[PDB]
Design a protein around this nucleic acid. Sequence first.
RNA 1: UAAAGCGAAUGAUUAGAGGUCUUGGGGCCGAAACGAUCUCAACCUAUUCUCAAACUUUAAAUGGGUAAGAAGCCCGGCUC
RNA 2: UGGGGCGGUACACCUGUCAAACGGUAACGCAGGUGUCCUAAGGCGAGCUCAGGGAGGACAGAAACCUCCCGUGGAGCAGAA
RNA 3: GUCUACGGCCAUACCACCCUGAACGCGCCCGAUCUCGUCUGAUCUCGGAAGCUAAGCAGGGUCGGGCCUGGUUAGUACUUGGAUGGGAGACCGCCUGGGAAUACCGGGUGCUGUAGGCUU
Lengths: 293, 134, 159, 170
Amino acid sequence: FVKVVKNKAYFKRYQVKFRRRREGKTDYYARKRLVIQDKNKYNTPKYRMIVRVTNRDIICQIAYARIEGDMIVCAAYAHELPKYGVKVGLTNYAAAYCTGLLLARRLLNRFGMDKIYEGQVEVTGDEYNVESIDGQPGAFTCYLDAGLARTTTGNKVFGALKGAVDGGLSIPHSTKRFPGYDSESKEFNAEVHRKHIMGQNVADYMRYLMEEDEDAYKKQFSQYIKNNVTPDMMEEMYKKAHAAIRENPVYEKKPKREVKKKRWNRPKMSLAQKKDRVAQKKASFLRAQERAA
Amino acid sequence: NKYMVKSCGKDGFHIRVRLHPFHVIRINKMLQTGMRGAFGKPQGTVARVHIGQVIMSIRTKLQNKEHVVEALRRAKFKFPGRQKIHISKKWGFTKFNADEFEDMVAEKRLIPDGCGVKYIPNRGPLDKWRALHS
Amino acid sequence: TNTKGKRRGTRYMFSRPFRKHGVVPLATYMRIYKKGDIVDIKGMGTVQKGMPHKCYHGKTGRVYNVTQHAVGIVVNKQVKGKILAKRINVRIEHIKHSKSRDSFLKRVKENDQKKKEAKEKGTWVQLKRQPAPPREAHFVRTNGKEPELLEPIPYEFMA
Amino acid sequence: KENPMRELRIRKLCLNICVGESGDRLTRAAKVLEQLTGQTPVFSKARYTVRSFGIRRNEKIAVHCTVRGAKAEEILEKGLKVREYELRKNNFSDTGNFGFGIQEHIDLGIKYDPSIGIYGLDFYVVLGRPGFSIADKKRRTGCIGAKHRISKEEAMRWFQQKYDGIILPG
RNA sequence: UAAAGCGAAUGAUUAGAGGUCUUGGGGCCGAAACGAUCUCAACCUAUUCUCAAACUUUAAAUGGGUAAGAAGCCCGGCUC
RNA sequence: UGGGGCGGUACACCUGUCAAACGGUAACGCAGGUGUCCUAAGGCGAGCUCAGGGAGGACAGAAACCUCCCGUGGAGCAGAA
RNA sequence: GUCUACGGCCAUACCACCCUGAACGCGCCCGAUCUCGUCUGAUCUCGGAAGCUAAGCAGGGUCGGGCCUGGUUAGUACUUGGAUGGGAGACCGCCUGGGAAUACCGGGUGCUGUAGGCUU
Ligand SMILES: [Mg+2]
Ligand SMILES: [Mg+2]
Ligand SMILES: [Mg+2]
Ligand SMILES: [Mg+2]
Ligand SMILES: [Mg+2]
Ligand SMILES: [Mg+2]
Ligand SMILES: [Mg+2]
């Protein structure tokens, strides 16, 4: 036999980690580097544009760090695009670009910077960045909080970056992780970036398979088929989506129905009951042992 | 040992010395250097003692009380100082008094376990208590 | 003769407590220090960069300068008979706001409140602190039963 | 009514050929797997020197290869067929895996190469189930619970159910 | 630091209990054999006697600092 | 310089204790180290997680290679701690 | 009632094992055409949404271990200052003030900030 590791001593000496290190979600090292201000700033906020891509969504938030717990100035989600006529592809690069456009215009709408700071309207895909205006209220700036994503070539965060930047935010960035950087040659095809942004990558995959074999097409693209989505319609769909967003991005909340009020969960068991169980078990055991003998 | 062997026979007691000597004592030897750099080599061990600390203990029956006494009184002459010979209230080498002991063992609070004895509390899981009474 | 090394006799001072090793909670960094704010010092082993010298450990002073990540701070060190106010550059992690001054400032604010009121009335409210007085006379109702008689127990030798 | 989410599958097969030497023996035994699988195996080297057996620290000794899926099922089928569908008890581990080792691959059926030579090799089957990569994904790790673990007994009865494969003591 | 602690870490250290092989030395009916057989060995689990200037979770008394208002509080407004 | 001499270097340096709970403190007192090494064993970023033990598998054996499980650091970070 | 994203304090929140989870989410889930990376599309990257809560997660459970908090231990040990106090010495008692720690016996098992969901 061998020594049991997990004794009392072990648990006494055992340090606990933070809640968000146990759940595996938050990296505190990077949080530290990202978030504090220089002391000579004195209470001047350091904004950060968080981006959290889920299984079936892409959330983009803005946050600044107070001691009580990081305050959100404004927040968007993907599932509002059915209102603006986008039924599917909510975790594609295009819907990332869309979400960045919302975040930008909703924020600028609150701060009263609507006629000023339009940005890139024509989606060429080359480099655009917001020059500050002389004699006017300066540009918004915030630093990117990728979080845990491996900052690899072709990521929906940097898609959302290109979108939100064109919406007009002063985020510093290179174009190196945008799709286009040939690893050998090191040049950037922005038009190919356009292609991914407009969604030809999906159309071309669905044609290649429809040509190849119809059955995979039917297994893969069910809701696409149901909703009568086609290669030709997709581009103008996303383009109208841009125009609708630019015009009226703001969110109106839903009316709360009076709640039914029922407890699905089981409440915690009181003292007297806990005291009773072992009494019944011992008495019942003694009389049952009489049954055995 | 010698006295108890002569008196109460080969199997009527258990002596237990309770003082392990850890302190090391030094010695300063003089072999012409003199007194300079004089820090000693090890001569040997010895055990430090506070007031009220037990040196020896002898367990046997209460019948052979005075003979135990006479052994310890003869043993005083090897040690220095002064020491008192006190008969213990404890049942053997335990921390539990003799009057309430048999009641406690009958109701199975304490359980013999060779020379030692295990105190059962109520804090464990109950299926152990079931195994005990079964 | 002993050595004049910087970390002499700091086997236990800087060692972090039990089950409190590891990462530094971010409040430390994300809290602010103004000029003239009274600040007390507490060394910390994790960050070796910018540790104050052990002598200044415990000492509390006021902040004369600020940089990106640090504060110069004035302390009164005693040397052989004269004291020297002297200034040390400390990175923030080794620092706390000493809360001694806040209760006094609460009392000034309380007096200006208590003076604005009870001004028109003309009642003369005691502003000053008045030291712990001799307790006044009072009645002890022995309702019924009598005092329990304590007796010194007789000696008995356990050992 | 048991759930479809416990269809007991194979995660991976782990081949290795520890010849214990560098150079010509090795490059040829690596090329044998090259002939079998059509894919480049990985050379592992030693932690430290042992002069009795004649190996030094950091010496490229062995070669190994991971395999997953149908290609693995096929090669497993041939291997067991050579082992005539019967194993021992001691072959099964407590974590629910198992393995075995043919003394030489030529036994499998593949022609001998004079230049390459003959080589024994060593199979090892890591079974799994749906819902094991939680512990190995980054974003939110987590232990997989008690029921979902694969027992030694349940792997034995599963092999016994599948191929009517007998298990013998040892 | 004194103390206290080792049924809590580290480091020494005495004593008997229960285990099966996690292995082994002497036998004895056994050729041997994890059959058994007496054993006695180390390991594992609950206990028990004793310790620490260069071990410590705990942890005092005495002490060392800082503050106890005009150099302060509260209003109105310029400059960068 | 516990007479000088012969012997040590306590003649400049560093860690722990002696130190009497801020800091500061002595003896040819104690236990010990130094007169170097580095093209990276320095600098950024990413990705990996160690010591030890258990059960399995041709040659393979107490000890060679692969695999699962436990693993608050019991390893390691050139060197004294 | 309860959840998601981002959090502060960092075990009353950990570990082990058993039971139950309406709705949307969270998850698992099916593929490799393009971007990307592999011994291996398992991990990482990307395109889907037929199936399922089995696991994860949540809540509850355990005369559970632990951790946190109380009483007891104890006005004991120890200690600031005093005396033509004792005692052959070791050491000890008194006045004046400060005052602990295990075993043992009880009790507890996350608090909460912003924005946005479900019960339309
Ligand atoms: Mg002591
Ligand atoms: Mg001289
Ligand atoms: Mg000191
Ligand atoms: Mg001192
Ligand atoms: Mg796959
Ligand atoms: Mg589930
Ligand atoms: Mg408990």
